[PDB]
Structure 1
């Protein structure tokens, strides 16, 4: 064949830290269908937002918003435990169906996005050029968000370890941990990946007695 229908830009959803996670890559032939399992960002999260995006940028805010919906009734559980299956199905007429189902509760929500939605030919060309020109910066943003999320994992696992340790953890150790947690918290608001990792390293240095407990 010398011609066929494609979806012209990547389609995905916003994930933790303001990043776009792709479900359907740009130039995929249509009809097409793809599913991916997601989980919750925070402990005890009972609702999630499915924000549908079109584009090639790593920052969710830089892509074209197609629509959004909420999925609630998720049993409050530790972060990473819920299994939220997100499906993107584009039919032969370019109609996009997005659904999200929580595997444990069976709760499901969906949206239909018309084929005419999104960016036009000139905006598609500008999106491709802008993604290309900002490739290094978008990579750096993605690396920062991963570090910010890992930074949060170390902050989360340390705090769980401290509460479990209780009275057994000495005062000198606990005070050094509390201050190092604050320094990490502050660096996380910044955009310097190395500064975050350094505050993570400083925390781990004062948590040696905590890891033993």
Structure 2
């Protein structure tokens, strides 16, 4: 009985969420990076997948890169002579997602929910699903990412209404629109171009730079892969940075050099120069959005609201440039790069939360005990307990050198011996001339399945076992219980009992 793990199976990289608590978190893969890149290559006949994959990609020409474009089609791929199918590939990817999720729980996992894009089909769908079982993950369900990323805000519990999700993947871009009818999603329109993404920004930065450099000092940087990389990265960090701040400085000193020696790439860059410099990605975007808008028969004001996804989506100009051509403020705070995986896990949590039925056992409807010494009632088994159980307790000599000990085993609530119902009254002899003090006696009450109650009475050191069994006969549970408890409520001030507690008086020997 494993949880139901949510997974987001993406083109660029894929992500895996689960819920435990009223709380749902995103399992990290063995390395850093809550988010795992989806890819795999084989070397040893042993698979490698996820980032440690991208690392050696350029050794073994056998590296499968975004497969998820090929699922649901006849396609196969040769690896050192042998052919594979997407579902098999994406499958091994999954074998990782599940695997390391198991690592994280120590709790093997099976049940799962996996997500695929809005535009996918029946074929493709049975291809991911297929892949899933293939990895060994029984699917509980398969559902379409934007819906899944509607469980960020989980609007199914809201007003029937039409809503746009705008997803900018890492290397993709897609847009979707769904009227939520009868509480669910009639996914009304799909759209959006398949080469787009952050890197399609990171790039324009990289371009602007290198061109600016060759410009002033005259070399084309794309040549040496060293400073190529340095550049790439630089630009990227610069991207994330300009996510929130209005300026930044890049250095890349010692980058390359002329005959006056070392050449230091420095600079300061704006928000705007990049905004405008990105302005093309900017305006090329929306076409899919609008085309979709009529594509369902809907007016720009026909939406209720507009989600977001696609961690690159946290951008000044995307955002600024959206809601304005649109309805209200884009929905926030759900951390996009996982937003989808979050949705998965949610719906999974729900899939486990199915069974609402109820049942019997039995509560021992009235709390049992023995008259204790001093003439009080002392429970050995609190009221609503369970199928047969056992309790054991001790108690000791009444007054100096007792030879014999009664046991009155009574059923009730109230503190006061006689103030309840009673039952068989047995005793134990064989007790020796031991003064009041520590002559201890273990007395237990067994219970067995149907309401039968044994009882034991035993001295410790002399091992004397005399004991009874109650037949559950005399005790009345029809009304009589649901009465004499409320008695305990009416009369609860019966705590007056402590009188005899105080009667500890005659304990003066």
TM-score band, normalised by shorter chain: 0.5 to 0.7
TM-score between the two structures when normalised by the length of structure 2: 0.29
Map of 1:209 onto structure 2? none
Map of 2:495 onto structure 1? 139
Shift of 1:68: 1.4
- In the alignment, is the contact (CA less than 8 A) between 1:41 and 1:80 conserved in 2? no
SS at match of 1:66: coil
Aligned length: 152
TM alignment of 1:20-169, pairs within 5 A: 20-136=377-493, 138-141=494-497, 143-149=498-504, 151-153=505-507, 155-156=508-509
Shift of 1:122: 1.0
SS at match of 1:7: coil
TM-score between the two structures when normalised by the length of structure 1: 0.68
Any idea what the Cα deviations from partners look like across 1:51-70, whole Å, max 9, x if unmatched? 10000011111111111111
**Structure 1: distance between partners of 2:437 and 2:466:** 20
SS at match of 1:20: strand
TM alignment of 1:130-209, pairs within 5 A: 130-136=487-493, 138-141=494-497, 143-149=498-504, 151-153=505-507, 155-156=508-509
**Structure 2: distance between partners of 1:32 and 1:115:** 16
Any idea what the Cα deviations from partners look like across 1:150-171, whole Å, max 9, x if unmatched? x223x33xxxxxxxxxxxxxxx
**Structure 2: distance between partners of 1:68 and 1:22:** 16
More helix by share: 1
Give unmatched runs, 5+ long, in structure 2: 1-357
Give the root-mean-square deviation of aligned CA atoms: 1.3
Shift of 1:113: 1.2
**Structure 1: distance between partners of 2:410 and 2:437:** 23
Any idea what the Cα deviations from partners look like across 1:51-90, whole Å, max 9, x if unmatched? 1000001111111111111100111212232211111111
Give unmatched runs, 5+ long, in structure 1: 157-213
Which of the pair has the greater relative contact order for Cα pairs under 8 Å at 6+ separation? Answer: 1
Shift of 1:104: 1.9
